[PDB]
Amino acid sequence: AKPQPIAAANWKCNGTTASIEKLVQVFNEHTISHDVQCVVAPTFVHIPLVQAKLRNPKYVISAQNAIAKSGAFTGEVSMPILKDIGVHWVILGHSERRTYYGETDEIVAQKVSEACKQGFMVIACIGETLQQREANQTAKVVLSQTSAIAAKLTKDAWNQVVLAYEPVWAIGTGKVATPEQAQEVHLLLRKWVSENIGTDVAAKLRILYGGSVNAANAATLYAKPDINGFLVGGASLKPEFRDIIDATR
Amino acid sequence: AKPQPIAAANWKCNGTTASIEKLVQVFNEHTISHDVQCVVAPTFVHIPLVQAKLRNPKYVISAQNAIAKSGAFTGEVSMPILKDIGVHWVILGHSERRTYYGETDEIVAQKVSEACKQGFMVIACIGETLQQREANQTAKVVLSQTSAIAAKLTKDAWNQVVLAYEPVWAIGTGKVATPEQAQEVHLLLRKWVSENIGTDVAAKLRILYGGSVNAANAATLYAKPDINGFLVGGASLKPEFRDIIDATR
Ligand SMILES: *C[C@H](O)COP(=O)(O)O
Ligand SMILES: *C[C@H](O)COP(=O)(O)O
């Protein structure tokens, strides 16, 4: 009795208007016949184009990042600005931003909290590095990341949260986690949520896997009992995202 | 024989589609009767709206930031993506990004270089802090910032560069630099450019002032011989930006 799956396309910093037009038509022409929330997260400047072209009723549009408040923050996009333009999903804490762009656990947690307060659905990203994995620290790391987020949330806010477990060593590298690796982590995360947040919350929570998901490995990942779908980078730029969606059947 | 002035609106992280519609109509209905490049820099998600609504022929649209290359940079917008959507102006190195968002001199210089290579007009921001000012380090600081940028540029690339001198203590604080303060810095910057880059380059270079510019203080700033216009934050969200433009006559 899994909760509704999610298939989320993180386009990252990629696209042209011609390429996006073509890919959106692919997405539109793919009839989805099961209950799944599809998400596409274009770059900020592409949000209006995607809003204008995307019509598949299974989809919503997400931002790839945000800051909490409007103001004197040259170059950034705030949560109120996104809400006003009709975007009410956001990806927060992607490894890329934790690594390159200074986002500590505290900063990610604050952003997630603020997003929930503003009515967003949030895909909050967590995951260990290769060195953490090899040091047998996977569980400690993902639980610390999750706990940091949880410390700024009320119980009710969790209804807006989606966790995305993405081992850093699997992101963009062609080294997907095995089904067993992912399931082990999703199980421990769900147990933590059950015990620390609530048993109801844990049963409803979507915990997505990401890191080198493709159309050929997705269904076997999805067969694991605590995997609720995917956060997809490279493969989401391609027509084979259709089969990743259908791997959540 | 000043070069063509620039009046640039840095909206920062502000706007709604309703507020932007209204302000763009104000800008459109203001007939400008002198040679000036007006620039408006909306948030990324607002670029398409501004592109659709802005018609005043004196204007171009700028990004408030960018990264050099497309790829696995969740949340960021690249220079090729901006070029493809029709944006070929960018503000780089704003204090807000140097201060909050990790942009060192090296990072700013690299971004400016890459933007010039990709055909952008670049508004490159420099300026000292209050503590640097009080330590008599203003000239050392702005010349170091400018030199860092220059080290990554060819002579020809300077035709695409605009400098914006914004003392950090003047940004958003209601403490504008005096005309004499700004002119002293613009003079020393232009002399450095003349001697280190070329006398032709220096004569053509626009050096803008920013930091608490408003419609009432702009004309007296513009009267100074080495001030070529303005990078405007708060006042650019208001109808009085019209009079800031006209203060460059
Ligand atoms: C959530 C991570 O973005 C996935 O990137 P991948 O290219 O799918 O590895
Ligand atoms: C270039 C600086 O953005 C200007 O901000 P101000 O609000 O005009 O001080």
UniProtKB/Swiss-Prot annotation, chains A, B:
Location in or out of the cell: Cytoplasm; Glycosome
| Any Pfam family matching the protein | TIM
> Catalytic center at which residues?
H94 (electrophile), E166 (proton acceptor)
> What EC number(s) does the entry state?
5.3.1.1
Specify the species. Leishmania mexicana
On subunit structure and binding partners, the annotation says:
Homodimer.
Report what the protein is called. Triosephosphate isomerase
UniProtKB keywords: Cytoplasm, Gluconeogenesis, Glycolysis, Glycosome, Isomerase, Peroxisome
Family annotation (InterPro entries): Aldolase_TIM (IPR013785), TIM_sf (IPR035990), TrioseP_Isoase_bac/euk (IPR022896), Triosephosphate_isomerase (IPR000652), Triosephosphate_isomerase_AS (IPR020861)
